[model samples]
Target: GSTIYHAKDAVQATKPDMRKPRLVVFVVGETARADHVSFNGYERDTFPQLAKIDGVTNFSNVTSCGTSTAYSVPCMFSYLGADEYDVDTAKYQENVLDTLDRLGVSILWRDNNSDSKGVMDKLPKAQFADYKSATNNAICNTNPYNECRDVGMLVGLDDFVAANNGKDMLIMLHQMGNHGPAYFKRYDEKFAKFTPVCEGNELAKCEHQSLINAYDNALLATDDFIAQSIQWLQTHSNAYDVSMLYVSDHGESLGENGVYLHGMPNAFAPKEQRSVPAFFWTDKQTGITPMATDTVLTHDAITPTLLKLFDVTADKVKDRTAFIR
Candidate 1:
């Protein structure tokens, strides 16, 4: 296919400087809303761990490119915006990962969600199924099917980082953060900080307050997962220039205007479905400065921002804008 051929050519055209070691742990959150996060002015202490971490920068006003994973995931990795994005066209184009992998950067994807929406189709991947059994207790779900928690991704991340230590590596952790209509099953009982959660999948049948409680509890879990990831990165700071970027694929609407979940047409979707949380944390030696807390950004800035962090030349990338200073 032309997509694979072009991707190959693009990868061969670039080269990464392996002399400087760096590690980027890009965590892709699922169905997370900005308003519900504590760092974004939510009353709940959803981000208790993240709030206490020094050097963490929160982008309170980031908008996602699309309202669903099928659209937003690829859009976040591509140079295209929402208006210009097409699923068919994306299949054949080389994404940011392709460029990085071609530049000799080691790329590894650890997924707890349903794969990376084909965004990592050609990249080396470690799925939850490879590490945990379907019947594992760490995987919590009310349904008979297995749905691993976001923490499950950490196991593979630890191994990937150890194996690629002292190298320029990009380890993408695709989390199952707050993915619904089974929010209650997304976390463990210990993380059930909110009471009277909506246990069933039928959002319309559940009380509105119960649904919010369930969803917020999931946010708490996500907060912990990200905090742990940062700690992991800090642990390896002695060996690599450690940094992390956390962003949701898109937000979700819990019974807002009668809309229960995401995937609504962009123009008709509520702001809650389009607004997402994005934050960055890095060791001081990386020379990467944080953006202003209120700086408005879109997922399109990710490709260029990452390229710049990796020291890739601006002329080598077609369309890119560094979101961070």
Candidate 2:
């Protein structure tokens, strides 16, 4: 049980009566733009299932604090807001994992990104790509990890949920998500509904349209994965009967201004590099709606909003004040 509301300077507060188990799935996709998703009105049907979710909140014009994963992930999770970009604050702020820890909540970070970078250091990790196996065709031999698909990440979630069996949880699905150089592998043959599979993931060699078709195909695949995941949750009765929040850690550059990949030099980084897609989905029965406002929100407010929504709070949480009212 937890307090519903607390007055300023109050010592104790009324606690919320627990009813059903609560589960927060923080799906962190890499390098996705708001303009590419169906929910955001992209021309392509990139997220058909997610678009249908009743409680979806699409924050358009939202921009990332940093252009690359190395800076973006930690910075977005840090106390620093979109307007604030002091690298020192990012390094110093208490992260989501610590906040959950203090609140006695469980958290699992399933990463499909690079081992050394991404959110691996912040939480529990399961690698999505296995280079040695032929089935693990997602990545190349030189740097096999980044090419992993969202589907691979889903398999890990399926296994973890099976093993855990209804424990209260916060699971972060960090998808490799349209990372360049091997975008075609992110989706299988079926999702390649579009023509020309990019020939090769190599941005340098491939035609621009070919690369884009491949990337969009991958997005469609991820959309299918999200839909299937919801269906699976419904099928698995024991798992917490709840909602999911999916947000891209950062957006990508697709030959815009002659930039084909992400992690661009900060000064040259345009809105395309900083802008990303963010939305939340829950079972219609939940009867909950996120603040219905056209207000421009950023990842800076996510941690606090999540904590407040779940009624979890602690000193380690940074910049939570932003989400409080």
Candidate 3:
């Protein structure tokens, strides 16, 4: 409750043209910078699994509304953009999740991050994920944050889908992806493919290369989780119309120009903090097309694109001034 809020605005979602039961999986990514992802031209193959997926479309030039999760994440879910959004009236407005819920779609949120910035606050207890006890996941016992590995979000998903049979659903998996200043803690020891990584939270004291190594390793985890989620969706493809969208909440400043981490003001935030990676995949659906790596886009594009995916004719796409193309 630090008083920060968001509004991306109000919109109505309907299932007029909805075909069969739909299963949409959206990953709410944490501090992932666009450049570090190999799909965006970084030398390292950080996204090996994702890159091999033929159906996956990586939007390379996406911008975020804010540098911090509190601002950018909720803003993407609301009707507000960076310029027109504010904290005072943010809470009073409804976001994409609220609109979808009102339209009779089931909402399930699985979070491995600190929290959802109150965006998922309205969901019932059953809809929210619990990583506290070992029952959900044993790996969740690792950190002081009581967080789980990104892949742990899929632990009980098989039963979740079976139980919610014949109904359209939205599952938001909030990843603790590349969150700093403890990037090394975001992944497993086996994923420590990058050498000489930074160990603790004091990012300024570590070598820049080590910090990058640690951050990249965390991203590798994100890559694995997303690819795994896609595979899971494919497994259920015959029973449900499936799609997955993965986009970072905002990028991070990896020791650039003396900025060790993110949370910079938008006007002054560096490209590393503003640029984010976005990907979408759908089985047998031609509704959303992949854009060029150089195509300009922003977080504002997410809400409208989601509406279009569900066949909800919300005319807010033009208002946001951005779209999936």
Candidate 4:
């Protein structure tokens, strides 16, 4: 048990005690485009699991602040581009994990990416090995060709939750969902619902339908991970009050505008690169409901939404004004 403090004027301020505990499992997908997932009405049954969960908000018009994970991860965590903190330069100056640390929230970063190259370096975290067995064995450099599997992320999380116990956990799942060069690895053999699947991530070399089939299967894998994680939270504790959020670090470019994978600078990125899917899943006991809205959301909403959910006050609350009261 460590003392937790909220920040005000750079001073550590104590927080008031609450009667109940809260848990959040944020699932961060790598290079997933909304149009490819069933939640966003993809013709394929890519998200059969997610669509059935009640109290889920599918914000279809969501976009990303950056096209690459390095920029998007930092931008997403710090509340950079949201209404309350709109200045790019200013948001770039801070880290959301620092703010949450001050707010007395337990933080954990479970990465399935390339060492979480940007944000992980800015926070205190216990880093895990990547998803691929071959990559893990060789200890080789993470290349664009070496894509990890979606279920690998779920396997890591199962081990993590079993070891750690508490209601106030802010677990970030940075998944290798639909990331190209190895899309075939994301899904299991049974969920290979699409036809003419591209066995590899070379988008240009594969036929258009083949590439889409691979991506669709990857989305299905992510859907399974999200569903299973939520079920775990429900069964594990009597004090279980949880929220599951699924969002992409950024999106993939499937041969659109002559682009294949992400890491392209934001300025030249296509709509697919910027457009992403985001939604929240809560335990049935939470009593929250999804609202109909034409309003658009972005990565900036992530931190503020979490803060408001926990009733924690943040210095920058402007960006989430549209979504929060």
lDDT of 3 at 93: 63
Q: lDDT values of the candidates?
A: 0.78, 0.60, 0.78, 0.65
Query: Candidate 3 — which residues are off by over 4 angstroms?
Result: 1-18, 132-135, 141-147, 285-287, 291-293, 318-325
Residue pairs clashing in model 2 are: none
Q: For model 1, how does the per-residue alpha-carbon lDDT over 41-121 read when each residue is reduced to its tens digit?
A: 898988898988888999988899889888888888875555677766786677888777778778877677766777776
Query: What TM-score, over all chains together, does every model reach?
Result: 0.89, 0.77, 0.89, 0.80
Expressed as tens digits, the lDDT of each residue in 1-325 for candidate 4 is 1212223433223332444566777777788887776657777777788778766777788888778766777677664463343333432355566666556666676666664545444355454344555543332133335444444444545455555444355677777667667787666666788888887545688888888788887777788877876776666436646777777888888887667888777657788888898877777665444435335777877766666555566665543542334
Misplaced by over 4 Å in model 2 are 1-17, 52-54, 83-92, 115-148, 156-167, 201-205, 235-241, 285-287, 314-325
Model 2, 1-325: lDDT tens digits are 1211112221112122354455667666688887887656678888776666555566665667777777777765554455665554454445555455445455666566653243334334442333223364333332334344455544545566655554555666666677766777677676787778685655767787788888898788777766665655555434354666666777887887677777776687777877787766666554456654345766776766566545555443434443224
Q: Give the TM-score of candidate 4.
A: 0.80
Worst 10 residues of 1 by lDDT: 7-16
Q: Quick one: ranking by TM-score, best first?
A: 3, 1, 4, 2
- Higher lDDT: candidate 1 or 4? 1
Give me the displacement of residue 108 in model 1, in angstroms: 0.7
Deviation in Å, model 4, residue 303 alpha carbon: 1.6
Model 4 ranges with Cα > 4 A deviation = 1-17, 82-92, 127-149, 152-167, 287-293, 322-325
Which residue pairs clash within candidate 3?
Answer: 7-80, 8-78, 8-79, 8-80, 9-78, 9-79
Q: Who is ahead in lDDT, 1 or 2?
A: 1
